[PDB]
Write a protein that binds this ligand. Structure first.
Ligand code: CA
Lengths: 384, 292, 247
């Protein structure tokens, strides 16, 4: 017997089977989402189980059990959170074979019985998804569970759902543990800032990678210029208040190198890996200030960290290292910075913000930047 | 009623066992198809399309657990998930999640299949099987011979297994994988739990040999190291051999050393403060400090 | 007091060898043989008779069927002796938990497999007595040295032991010899378990009667233990899955 040849052929067959069955695996996993959507179809109409399933009792019980099993079985909690996130996602195609398998499975199980996303989000919120997310974020000590909770929050709030925002605000206000929620968020923000500062001093860490989902969640809270959420993120009216707008500005300032970055060394600090996080931070600040929220604008403009200078430098500076290789990201960064600066002066008749911005954003350099951007069109490459 | 919930839990456990048996049958079917194709191609190219088609077909059938094509199974799982008893709901949820991952589970299990073709491999497999079976049978009757020829036979079996562990990086890895597949570690751990008196030198020698085998089992193998770490509570006792085994388990393992729990670390300092027997505790701490 | 000894035998559903051995050395000692009801089978095909010594050291022997009939009639002494026997059987099962061979060797001789099967299968006895006998059979005979837990999935397989074509019947025929060998002993128990499960599933409300729930739980636990010891082939397991799901 050819031992080596037999092993090699077995490995080749394993690889081929793994490659072949991937769409089928995806379709089979997807069918679970449909089953969870309409459990009552498994039972007979008019039965007690049918009544329990139809009214959403199954989903509410699942959410309650997920809350209960946070400490008993972390893996099961992660699996259920991922399943909920998949339930909140848009439909996808898995090829001809995948679609055939999915249709066959749906027929076998269920005999013949953005608007959809919004309806699903509202249904999950009714079943208590928002409360589950808040409880998990406040109480969980597991990094994976926290990540899944933040992802579920983002999926629930995706697209700027007013009902989900109202539910979040009601939970933050009425509930007595909102203080712990904001304290946890503030502590994670501070840890990310400290890690980024240490890395910058040395010269990308889970504590820094987690900032992207947190910033996205905070932006989604304030989406569509939600004044209540915009003001709450600055002051919570609790015994101790955590200003997340100020912390976001501080994170942006530390990421870009602080005063040294503003002087003109911004290019070194910003690179391909961390550019997306800076873009997300700029978008979050813009969502904070737009609507407008005058208090947030004043907080950002008059901050002691002088983070407005960072934004002006972002607009003026060329980002020499990154721009040579990826000019599209630099253009996106400049566009986001300009949007943030515009939002900082949305409906301010006084000149305070304008003068503060002009202190660091000199007119000649701004005009030169505008002219260079206009002339760069002939050198533009195919990009969004 | 609690009785009904316990009965349903037992039924669920039976269902898990039968599903595992079905998974084993699927793996056997895939192996048979592969062997048939290999024999056809090499009586002394491969049509991978046919094998892929057969694998896809085998997941379609007589392997179903109900006459409704899995509808009754899903209905029962949902109904049980609606119940209040936490263990029952957890089991139902686990079965529900496993239901829609059959292809992934089958591929994962097929990846781990180990084939024994060489004559030396077959002889090693037979010897290990016989030795482990005899050791398990003798350990199961501890009360009969524990304070006879049992001690000598057990000592010979431990020495034979220790010699069978192998020498050489590739040989050691292969033998460790084979021993893991034959569940020798479970037999050794069960032997450690055997009750015995403190004034039997023969039993002390047997336990020393068992600890040596356990240390050789996880020597340089992160998988076996984690497998033994799954049963830490046995080794957390006031002994020198236990300290050596703990050191070997944690030796060169960042995933284990970094995430070492507080009570485990306090255990050795407590022993040093109260006993201070030897330098074994200090050695364990030193190896825990650095990893990879 | 027998119940209290039973709790002392175990802790958190896990047998403690020390206390188990201490209780076994005393309960089963010949000097304390007057506090345990003796059970035997006589031709009289065969009938099970219980003989016990009263408080005043008076021997009393009676058939189990007579005890059950009198207890159902309304007699209190027969009910008391039946309850004492049930608690004694519970204590015997507990003392043999986790393969305590010291007590298993003694108990097996007094209560054989055939006697326990006859007592449990009889439908004239109360469900509690049948449940106790099923528990004793599970914890005295099934969980013995010959039986061993079987891993359903095997990762190490010989190249020469892989058939070219495999079916369910051929798949389960690899080790049919050992299965038949253990069937030669446990065939009656397996048939009784299958019939009981079929009857339970046939009923509209399987968990209606509270008394029958205990017997159902013991039968299900016995089936679980038998399955986990490889007493059934894949085809029989597939057949039994339908009944288990229907229940
Ligand atoms: Ca024993």
């Amino acid at each position: 017997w050819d031992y080596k040849n037999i092993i090699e052929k077995l490995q080749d067959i394993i690889t081929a089977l793994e490659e072949r069955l991937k769409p089928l695996v995806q379709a089979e996993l997807s069918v679970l989402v449909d089953v969870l959507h309409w459990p009552e179809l498994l039972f007979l109409e008019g039965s007690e189980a049918y009544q329990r399933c139809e009214s959403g009792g199954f989903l509410s019980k699942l959410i309650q059990h997920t809350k209960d099993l946070m400490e008993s079985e972390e893996k099961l909690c992660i699996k259920v959170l991922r399943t909920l996130q998949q339930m909140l996602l848009k439909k996808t195609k898995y090829g001809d074979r995948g679609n055939q398998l999915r249709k066959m499975l749906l027929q076998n199980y269920l005999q013949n019985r953005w608007s959809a996303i919004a309806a699903t989000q509202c249904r999950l919120d009714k079943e208590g998804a928002t409360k589950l997310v808040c409880d998990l974020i406040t109480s969980t000590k597991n990094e994976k569970i926290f990540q899944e909770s933040i992802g579920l929050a983002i999926h629930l709030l995706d697209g700027g759902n007013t009902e989900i925002q109202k539910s979040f605000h009601n939970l933050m206000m009425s509930d007595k543990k909102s203080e712990r929620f904001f304290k946890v968020l503030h502590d994670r923000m501070k840890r990310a800032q400290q890690e980024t500062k240490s890395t910058v001093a040395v010269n990308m860490g889970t504590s820094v990678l987690i900032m992207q989902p947190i910033l996205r969640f905070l932006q989604l809270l304030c989406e569509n210029h939600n004044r209540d959420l915009q003001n709450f993120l600055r002051c919570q009216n609790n015994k101790t208040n955590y200003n997340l707008v100020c912390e976001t500005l501080q994170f942006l300032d530390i990421m870009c190198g602080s005063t040294t970055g503003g002087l003109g060394l911004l290019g070194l600090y910003i690179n391909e890996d961390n550019v997306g996080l800076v873009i997300q931070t700029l978008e979050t600040l813009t969502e904070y200030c737009q609507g407008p929220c005058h208090e947030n604008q004043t907080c950002i403009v008059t901050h002691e960290s002088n983070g407005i200078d960072i934004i002006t430098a972002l607009i003026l500076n060329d980002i020499s290292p990154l721009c040579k290789y990826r000019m599209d990201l630099v253009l996106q960064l400049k566009d986001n910075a300009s949007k943030l600066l515009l939002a900082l002066m949305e409906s301010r008749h006084d000149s305070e913000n304008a003068e503060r911005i002009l202190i660091s954003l000199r007119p000649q350099e701004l005009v030169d930047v505008i002219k260079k951007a206009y002339l760069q069109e002939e050198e533009r490459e195919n990009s969004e | 009623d609690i009785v009904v919930m316990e009965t349903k839990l037992k039924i669920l456990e039976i269902l898990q066992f039968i599903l595992n048996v079905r998974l084993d049958y699927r793996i056997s079917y895939l192996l048979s198809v592969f062997k048939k194709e290999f024999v056809e191609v090499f009586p002394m190219n491969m049509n991978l399309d046919r094998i892929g088609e057969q694998a896809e077909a085998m997941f379609g059938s007589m392997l179903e657990v109900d006459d409704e094509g899995g509808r009754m199974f899903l209905r029962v799982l949902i109904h049980l998930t609606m119940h209040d008893y936490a263990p029952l709901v957890s089991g139902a949820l686990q079965l529900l999640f496993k239901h829609f991952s059959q292809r992934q589970e089958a591929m994962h299990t097929f990846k781990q299949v180990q084939l024994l073709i060489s004559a030396q491999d077959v002889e090693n497999y037979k010897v290990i099987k016989s030795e482990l079976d005899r050791l398990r049978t003798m350990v199961e009757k501890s009360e009969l011979w524990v304070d006879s020829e049992n001690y000598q036979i057990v000592k010979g079996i431990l020495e034979r297994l220790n010699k069978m562990c192998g020498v050489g990086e590739q040989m050691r890895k292969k033998q460790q994988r084979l021993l893991k597949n034959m569940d020798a570690h479970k037999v050794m751990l069960d032997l450690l739990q055997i009750p015995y008196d403190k004034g039997d030198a023969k039993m002390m020698e047997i336990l020393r040999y068992t600890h040596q085998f356990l240390q050789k089992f996880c020597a340089g193998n992160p998988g076996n190291q984690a497998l033994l770490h799954k049963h830490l509570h046995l080794f957390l006792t006031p002994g020198l051999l236990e300290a050596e085994t703990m050191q070997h388990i944690f030796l060169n393992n960042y995933q284990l050393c970094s995430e070492i729990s507080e009570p485990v670390l306090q255990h050795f300092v407590h022993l040093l403060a109260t006993h201070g027997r030897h330098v074994q505790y200090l050695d364990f701490l030193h190896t825990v400090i650095k990893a990879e | 007091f027998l119940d209290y000894l039973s709790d002392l035998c175990v802790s958190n559903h896990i047998a403690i060898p020390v206390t188990q051995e201490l209780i076994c050395k005393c309960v089963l000692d010949p000097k304390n043989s007057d506090i345990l009801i003796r059970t035997e089978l006589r031709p009289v095909e065969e009938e099970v008779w219980l003989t016990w010594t009263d408080k005043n050291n008076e021997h009393h022997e009676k058939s189990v069927r007579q005890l059950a009939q009198e207890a159902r009639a309304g007699n209190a002494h027969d009910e008391n002796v039946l309850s004492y026997y049930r608690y004694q059987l519970k204590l015997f099962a507990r003392m043999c938990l986790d393969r305590q061979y010291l007590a298993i060797d003694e108990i097996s001789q007094q209560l054989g497999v055939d006697l326990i099967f006859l007592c449990m299968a009889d439908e004239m006895l109360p469900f509690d007595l049948r449940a106790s006998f099923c528990h004793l059979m599970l914890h005295v005979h099934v969980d013995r040295d010959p039986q061993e837990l079987v891993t359903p999935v095997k990762f190490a397989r010989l190249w020469t032991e892989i058939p070219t074509a495999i079916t369910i019947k051929d798949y389960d025929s690899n080790l049919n010899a050992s299965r038949d060998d253990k069937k030669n002993k446990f065939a009656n128990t397996m048939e009784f378990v299958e019939d009981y499960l079929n009857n339970v599933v046939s009923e509209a409300v399987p968990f209606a009667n509270e008394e029958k729930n205990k017997l159902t739980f013991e039968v299900v636990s016995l089936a679980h233990n038998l399955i986990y010891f490889g007493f059934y082939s894949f085809s029989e397991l597939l057949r039994l899955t339908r009944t288990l799901l229907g229940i």
